Design a protein around this ligand. Sequence first.
Ligand code: KJ9
Lengths: 256, 233, 237, 49
Amino acid sequence: RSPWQIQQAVLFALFLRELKTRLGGRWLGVFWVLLEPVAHIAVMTTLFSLAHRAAMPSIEYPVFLITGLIPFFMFRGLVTRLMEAIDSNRGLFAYRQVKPIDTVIARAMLEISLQSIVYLIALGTLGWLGFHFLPVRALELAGVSAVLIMLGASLGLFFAVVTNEIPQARAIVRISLLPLYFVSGVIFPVHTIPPQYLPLLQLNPVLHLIELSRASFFPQYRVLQGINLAYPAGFALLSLFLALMLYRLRRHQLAS
Amino acid sequence: VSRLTAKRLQWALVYLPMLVATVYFLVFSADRYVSESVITVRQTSASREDTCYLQTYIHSMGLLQKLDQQLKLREHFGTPLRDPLFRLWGGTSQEWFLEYYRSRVEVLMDDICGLLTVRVQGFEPEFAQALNRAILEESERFVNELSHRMAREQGQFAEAELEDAYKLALAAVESARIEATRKLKSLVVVEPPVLPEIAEYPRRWYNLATLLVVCCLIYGVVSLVVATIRDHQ
Amino acid sequence: KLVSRLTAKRLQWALVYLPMLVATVYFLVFSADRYVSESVITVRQTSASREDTCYLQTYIHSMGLLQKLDQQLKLREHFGTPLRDPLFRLWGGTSQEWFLEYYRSRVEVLMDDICGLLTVRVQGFEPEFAQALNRAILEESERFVNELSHRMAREQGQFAEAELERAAYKLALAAVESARIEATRKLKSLVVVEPPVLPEIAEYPRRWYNLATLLVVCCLIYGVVSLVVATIRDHQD
Amino acid sequence: LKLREHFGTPLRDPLFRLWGGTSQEWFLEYYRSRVEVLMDDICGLLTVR
Ligand SMILES: CCCCCCCCCCCC(=O)O[C@@H](COC(=O)CCCCCCCCCC)COP(=O)(O)OC[C@H](O)CO[C@@]1(C(=O)O)C[C@H](O)[C@@H](O)[C@H]([C@@H](O)CO)O1
């Protein structure tokens, strides 16, 4: 058989396996996945609705939080789930077809599908409640989201390859992921951030991607000076190149 | 699979796009001189709303109509026939003309002090300097006329109303006409438009090196991906 | 066909040592000293004023000030004096935009908004020239902040003259007198906290610092190319 | 200006035309759809397209 057809076979096999293990069997995890964004909205909107109305009166808070959260949740999942991909499937790593790249690709596909479903559900719910839920510019939003996908998957593969040993180091991944929820422009607009903190704030590619996605979503949204797509695109490209090279070096050392 | 050999991959990923790009950037691209001026609007004896008008009047369509009817920008931007990307093709729509003009004239507002900088591109440095000067002059005239219209509309009521009543009527008429004739606000020129020597656009070697790095990275990524795919046997 | 050549020693000598020896022999011998003169000023209205200081911060790096300075002091001839340090000299016949970039890199302006001050640091190959350049910058800055309001005063005086031409009479005469007073008065004065000083030892060629950054950048380059070479070698199995 | 008379002219388009004899509320919604008013926060300029 060709490598391509056996590739579809093995990726379909690990995709259904990963759906089985993540969904709990009885399809109970969908409630958790659906409930985290709405719980985040319910916590988030009860203290800063008035502050946001003072800041940006033309933009509704819930749609702003949908566009700020769901891409960030998708990126966080793409990092976390793919980082710990090798250890979960360790017991079945000797079938001559179950190389780790297939496992990380299957996890990435599963997470992309799940979060895209959640995105569609959230947009439909927002439209059902009388909010604004059609992006004025669609395919630029799709391109920014694709850049986010490439960056997140690349970072996840890089961390999975680098930290095959010393799993304690995985901690300083997820513990470091929690500040990224606050520093990036997810829950509150970065318009209110004082400019003297602005330069270091520009070092976050996720902030650039979130701001560009929001700009492509809403009509007449202003971008800050220094926000661009070139920096996060180059970050994603370099990280993907580094991750692929590092996996190619240590390809044979991820079997036991 | 077996069709995507290494030689074909590098010929189609790093060689051919770079060859096309360097041909375009060295034999076809046209220089674009840039002239920069720095202004602010002051009230002669708060002001953020006054300078916020200029940020959208410069890109407004009426100013574009005035500029073209003055300096004939439509046939100037169509002069360089070698470059097919940064030239303005003849017979294009008015909206495309407005978009092209908005691309050429770039306005930055720095809000920590309300300083507005205008950078104007052109194909001749003298033309860019003249265009910047015309933009500044028309902006000053417009920000004058904005208050002039309100003052003269006040004066029309005063002349329509027209011996204590006569005295107050003539006093109001005098106040209205001194309002409609005065120089209400002036545009302070922190940095007058300059005449550039060389063209800073396009900085060819920067994009050549950056795009060479980009194709090198992309070809490496594709080669590693197809190697990992072909690993399965 | 190539990986049998670039071993560890060859790559180390190619990217970690030879550029580093070149950098050291350039910095310790070929580089030219640059003396720094520093002054500290602010603008207060006679009889906040942050906007005046920001106008000044823009005007220091402006093209017109550079034209006035070079004409007055012949900056181009001075900055082309040392032939020993080209990587920091102003080559003759360069464009006006590169001249602006060189002048902008040679003069540092620091805002301090907590206390409201402007710091001007000027680098020159001789200390007397640096001090003279700083003094010329200060005097032209004061003249500019004078003329900025002088222009508006004259602009109002033009309408005052128009009003006297129209004509009451004593009110017009008083307005014209006030207009010429405004056009002649020293409205704004630039007060100086630290006048420009005469340096003795050059400061900005901090050679050890650039060598320290060169260490880490050459190490990063060496690591990246070593990883690429290892990838190619693995591909050639 | 007879807006209802004008908006019923294009018979080729079946979704972006105003049909005849529709409800007054639907007419108001269609008019709100056509006229776009955007208010900008920083300066207060109102743009009508
Ligand atoms: C790239 C490095 C950057 C460092 C950032 C540090 C900032 C604080 C981080 C919080 C640190 C933290 O952990 O979160 C706290 C609560 O956070 C907050 O509210 C943050 C409030 C404000 C921050 C956001 C504002 C940002 C403003 C601008 C930046 C409880 O989280 P948690 O319940 O998950 O704690 C679980 C432990 O972390 C477990 O880790 C262990 C351990 O302690 O047992 C496990 C194991 O032993 C080993 O793997 C491991 C160790 O040994 C290996 O070094 O430590």
